[PDB]
C-alpha cells in the first residue's frame, strides 16, 4: 500500500487528528497496521508516522494514535535533522531528538526505551542534551536515563551539552551524580568545550561540583584550550582554583589577546595589543629567575622579524597592525606547535586581511605557511590550494607580480597533499569514501586551478623546471577521475567546472598551454576513459571551433604528434571523425 | 459511496483542528454517522476533542 | 524586444518572445532582434532567439547578422548563428575571414595570430573538398594595402 | 579632538556617514575610538555615535561601525528616554527598544550583548516586549538569549 | 497660522519630516507635534497624517496629539 | 578645499541623493573624489553608500 500508507502518514504528520481519526478506526486492523508501522518514501526516511508527529510535537495526535492500536513506543525510524543524517532511535528519543516534552512526557508514562541507543548510541538524554532542552533533561534523569552514556567518539551526554551554552542542563547532570571528567576519544571534557566557547558560567558549575580538573588528550589543559580562543574569562576563573601555574598564565594572556584580532570574527588590537602587554608585564614580574618566551626566528612564509622581547618592545609595533598580530602569533606558533589546527587558522585571516588591503605580496607569502603548518599536521589543504589560485588570479587583475619560488613551493606541497589525498581515499574504507573520492577529485582542479594561473603569470626558469615537476609527478601518478579521465583528460575537456572567482578570466579550458605542458612529461595521450574515449576523442567533441580556435589549432598538432590513433574507437564503437559533430574540428582532425 | 463518507470524516471537521470548533465538531456530528464506523468515529473525535468537549461533541 | 537585447538582460528577451510577440521585428535601420545584440556578446540573448527562430536576415546595409556577429569581434553569437537554420558554406567561410579581419586592426580587438588563425579556418573549408573548389575573387590590388592580391593559398597565407 | 567627537557624534545622531568618515579619514585607530568613544551626555543623558546610530534606526550607519570600524557594543546610554532615562544601554538593547528590526537582526549576526543586564538589570528581551515588535522578539528568540530576565521588581518580559 | 508661525510650521514640517527620516521619531514627532499645535487646519492636516505616518508612529503621535 | 569644501560636495550629492536626480548627485560626488587627498580609500566606503543604480553613474564619472 503507498497511497494508504502515505495518507495515514499525513494523518499524524500534518496534526490533522480527525483523519486519523477515520483512518485507524472505521476501516479493519490488520492493514492499518502496516500503515502506522512506518513509512517509505514520505519525508525521505523510514519512521513511524507517530514518530514523525512526534518530531513536530503532536502530542494530542500520538495520543489518538495509540488509543486505536498501540503502536510500538520502542519502534524505531530515520530522523534526518541537525547533526548530520540520522536513523534515529525510538519516538521518546526522536521526542528528544526533537526536543518537544509534549511527547516525551507521554511516552514515559506510556511505556517506552529510556536508555535506547541510536547510530551514534545516543539516549535520550543525549537527544536532549543535543537540543539542550532542559525540562527533557530533567525527565530522563527522573527516569534514572544512564548519566554517562559515552559516544563512539567517547562523548557523555553531559559533555554534549557543554558543546552549546546551556549553563543549567550541563549543572543538572551534575546535581545528577555526574562529575565533569568523561574523556572523548580525543580526550576531550566538559571543561574544555565550555572553555573553546569561553563559558565562565558553565566551567564554574563544574568549578561547584569540585571533581577534577586536568588536560585533554590533545595536552591542553582548559586555560590553554581557551587560550587559543577569544575569551579570558575562563582563565581568570581558573585563576582562582589557581589552576594557573604562571608559565602557564602568562602564556594565557599572551594568546588570548593575539586570537581577538587574528579572527574573521574577532578583530580588535586594543585588548590583543593590552593582554600582550599585560602578559609581557607578568612575565617581567618574575624579576630574579625570569623566565621568557622560546624565541622563535621569523619564518621565511610568514613575516620577517621574531617576536618581541620587552613587554614596551610591542607598544611601537601596534601602529602597523602587521608587525604585532604576526608578534602575537610567534609566541602562539612556539607553545602549540607545528601542527595545531587552532593556531593555522589565523594564518589565512592574516592573508585574507593582506587580500582585503591589497596586500598580494603579503597575502601570497604568509599564506605558505598554512599550507606548511597543515602539512605538518598531516591533513587536507584542498580549501587552502583553491584559495591560493583565487588570489593567485586576483593578484593579476592588480597586476602584482608572484614570487617563482613562492608559487613553487604552494605547487610542491600541492602534490604532497595530492598524494597524501590520493592517500585519503585508500585510508578510509566506509565512512567518508564518496566524501574522499570527491576530496583527491577536488585537489587535481586545484592544481590545474594552480598550474594554469602559473602560465599565465611570470616564472622564473629554474623554478619552472621545478613546476613541470609536479606535472611530471601527476603524470606517472595518473589520477583516474570517476568518469575515468585523467589529468590531460580534464584539461583537454571543456565541461571541466571552473571556480566562480577571477580564475575564470585565466583559465581558457580546453586548455593550449597546459595540455602542451602535460605531453612533454609522458602524458597518456592513448589513455581510455570510462566510455573509452581517448585524449583525441575528448577534444574533437568540442562543439566550439571558432571562440577558442587558439587552443584547438594548438591542441591538434601538439596531442597528435604525442602518439594518437587517428583510428581510436571508444567503448561505443566510434572513430575520432565520426565523434566530431563539427566540421572545423573534424578538418583539424583529418589534417593531422 | 463510503469514500465520500470517510472524507467527510476527514475534512468535515477541518475547523475544529484549527480552532474553530464551532463550525468543526457540530458538521463532524452527522459526520460521524455518515462513516461506516459511527459509534467508532464519534467516540474517537470525542478523544480528538477535550473530556469535557467529549459530551459536547457527541450531543450535537 | 531589441531594446532589452541591446543590454544584458536575458530574462526581459526570453520572457517578451513567449509574449506572442515576434523576433522578426525589423527597425528601418536594420537590426532585426539580433544585430542589436551583436555588441557585447549577448551569448545567453541569441541562444534564446536561435530556439526562438531568429529568422536571419540582412540589415539596412546588407550585411548579415553573421556578419554582424562578426562585426564586433563576437565569435560566441558567430557559432550561433553559423550552425542555425542554413549552414549557407558561401557565407560560413567568408565570416571567419571577417572575423578574423579586425582580430588584428580593431582597438577593442588586437589578436593578431586570431586573425591568421581565422583565416586559416577559411583557408581549410576552402580547399577541403578537392572538386568543385572555390576561390576568392580577385580584386585588383590597393594601394593603401600595399599591392598584395589577398590570401588565395594557404601557402602563402 | 573634543569637538571632533561632539561633530561625529552629530554626524551619527542624524545619520550622514561621509560626513564622519572623512572627519576620521587618515587617522589611527586611538583618536578614531576616542570619538566613537564620545560616551558624554548630551542633552543631559549619556549618548555615543554608535547607540544613538543603534538608536536612529539607520543600519547603514552600524554596519560601517562594526564591519569597517572598531567599536564595541558594551557601552552606556539611554534605554528609555521619556522619565526612565537609565544607563548600561548595549546598543542592541537600544536598536530593540527603538524598534528597528534590521538594526536589531544586524547586531544579533554581528555579535551583540543579548543577555545584558543594566544597574536595573532589564534586558533587551523585555524592551522589545515594551514596544511590541513581534519580529524582534522572534529573532531573539530564535538566536536564544533567555527567557527569565527580570527587573529588580522581579518584572518579568 | 501665517506670520512667523506660518515660516515656524513648515520648518517644523521639513524638520519633523528629516528626523522622522533619519530615525529620530520621539524628537521628530514632537517637532512635528509642535507644527500641528501651529496649524492652520490641524483638522485636515489629520487626514493626510493618517496615511504619512506608520501606524506604529501615528499612534506614537496620537499619544502626544493632546 | 581638500577637507573644507570637500565636506560640502559629498552633502550637495547627499541631498540629491535624497532627492532623486542622482546623476547631479553623482557630480558633486565625482568632484568630491577628484579632489579627496585619499580617495583610494574610500573605494570600499563608496561603493555600498549608493543604490545599485548610482554605481554606474559613479564609476564611469572618476576617470
Known amino acids: ?592 | 459511496v463510503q469514500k465520500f463518507f470517510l472524507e467527510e470524516i476527514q475534512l468535515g471537521e477541518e475547523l475544529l483542528a484549527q480552532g474553530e470548533y464551532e463550525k468543526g465538531v457540530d458538521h463532524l456530528t452527522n459526520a460521524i454517522a455518515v462513516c461506516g464506523q459511527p459509534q467508532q468515529l464519534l467516540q474517537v473525535l470525542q478523544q480528538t476533542l477535550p473530556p469535557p468537549v467529549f459530551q459536547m461533541l457527541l450531543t450535537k
Open chain 1, 1 to 592: 500500500m503507498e497511497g494508504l500508507a502515505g495518507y495515514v502518514y499525513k494523518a499524524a504528520s500534518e496534526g490533522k487528528v480527525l483523519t486519523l481519526a477515520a483512518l485507524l478506526l472505521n476501516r479493519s486492523e490488520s492493514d492499518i497496521r502496516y500503515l502506522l508501522g512506518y513509512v517509505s518514501q514520505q519525508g525521505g526516511q523510514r519512521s513511524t508516522p507517530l514518530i514523525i508527529a512526534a518530531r513536530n510535537g503532536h502530542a494530542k495526535v500520538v495520543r489518538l494514535l495509540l488509543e486505536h492500536y498501540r503502536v510500538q513506543t520502542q519502534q524505531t525510524g530515520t530522523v534526518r535533522f541537525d547533526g548530520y543524517v540520522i536513523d534515529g532511535a525510538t519516538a521518546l528519543w526522536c521526542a528528544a531528538g526533537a526536543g518537544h516534552f509534549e511527547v516525551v512526557k507521554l511516552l514515559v508514562s506510556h511505556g517506552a526505551n529510556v536508555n535506547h541507543t541510536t547510530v551514534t548510541n545516543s539516549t535520550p538524554l543525549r537527544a536532549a542534551c543535543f537540543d539542550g532542552r532542559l525540562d527533557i533533561v530533567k525527565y530522563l534523569v527522573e527516569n534514572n536515563a544512564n548519566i554517562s552514556i559515552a559516544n563512539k567518539y567517547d562523548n557523555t551526554c553531559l559533555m554534549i551539552a557543554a558543546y552549546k551554552g546551556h549553563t543549567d542542563v550541563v549543572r543538572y547532570l551534575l546535581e545528577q551524580r555526574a562529575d565533569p571528567n568523561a574523556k572523548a576519544h580525543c580526550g576531550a571534557t566538559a571543561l574544555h568545550f565550555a572553555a573553546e566557547a569561553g563559558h565562565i558560567d558553565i566551567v564554574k558549575e563544574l568549578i561547584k561540583w569540585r571533581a577534577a580538573i586536568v588536560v585533554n588528550g590533545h595536552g591542553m589543559t582548559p586555560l590553554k584550550v581557551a587560550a587559543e580562543s577569544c575569551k579570558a574569562d575562563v582563565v581568570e576563573l581558573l585563576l582562582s582554583h589557581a589552576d594557573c601555574d604562571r608559565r602557564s598564565r602568562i602564556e594565557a594572556l599572551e594568546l588570548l589577546g593575539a586570537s581577538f584580532a587574528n579572527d574573521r570574527e574577532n578583530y580588535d588590537i586594543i585588548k590583543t595589543y593590552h593582554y600582550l602587554y599585560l602578559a609581557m608585564l607578568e612575565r617581567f614580574q618574575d624579576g630574579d629567575n625570569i623566565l621568557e618566551k622560546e624565541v622563535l626566528p621569523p619564518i621565511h612564509a610568514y613575516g620577517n622579524r621574531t617576536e618581541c622581547r620587552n613587554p614596551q618592545e610591542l607598544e611601537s609595533i601596534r601602529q602597523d597592525r602587521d608587525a604585532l598580530h604576526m608578534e602575537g602569533l610567534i609566541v602562539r606558533e612556539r607553545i602549540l606547535g607545528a601542527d595545531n589546527i587552532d593556531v593555522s587558522h589565523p594564518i589565512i585571516y592574516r592573508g585574507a586581511v593582506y587580500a582585503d588591503n591589497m596586500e598580494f605580496e603579503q597575502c601570497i607569502k604568509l599564506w605558505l605557511h598554512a599550507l606548511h603548518l597543515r602539512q605538518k599536521g598531516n591533513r587536507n589543504t584542498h580549501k587552502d590550494l583553491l584559495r591560493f589560485a583565487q588570489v593567485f588570479s586576483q593578484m593579476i587583475h592588480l597586476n602584482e607580480t608572484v614570487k617563482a619560488p613562492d608559487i613553487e613551493c604552494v605547487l610542491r606541497c600541492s602534490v604532497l597533499e595530492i598524494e597524501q589525498s590520493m592517500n585519503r581515499v585508500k585510508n578510509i574504507s566506509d565512512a567518508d569514501v564518496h566524501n574522499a573520492m570527491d576530496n583527491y577529485e577536488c585537489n587535481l582542479y586545484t592544481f590545474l586551478y594552480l598550474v594554469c594561473i602559473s602560465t599565465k603569470t611570470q616564472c622564473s626558469e629554474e623554478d619552472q623546471c621545478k613546476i613541470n615537476k609536479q606535472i611530471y609527478n601527476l603524470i606517472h601518478l595518473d589520477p583516474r577521475t570517476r568518469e575515468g579521465f585523467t589529468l590531460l583528460h580534464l584539461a583537454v575537456n571543456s565541461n571541466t567546472p571552473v571556480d566562480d572567482f577571477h580564475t575564470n578570466d585565466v583559465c581558457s579550458f580546453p586548455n593550449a598551454l597546459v595540455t602542451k605542458l602535460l605531453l612533454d612529461c609522458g602524458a597518456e595521450v592513448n589513455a581510455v576513459d570510462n566510455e573509452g574515449n581517448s585524449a583525441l576523442h575528448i577534444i574533437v567533441q568540442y562543439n566550439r571551433p571558432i571562440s577558442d580556435f587558439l587552443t584547438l589549432h594548438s591542441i591538434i598538432i601538439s596531442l597528435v604528434e604525442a602518439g594518437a590513433h587517428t583510428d581510436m574507437t571508444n567503448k561505443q564503437n566510434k572513430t575520432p571523425l565520426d565523434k566530431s559533430t563539427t566540421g572545423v574540428s573534424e578538418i583539424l582532425l583529418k589534417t593531422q
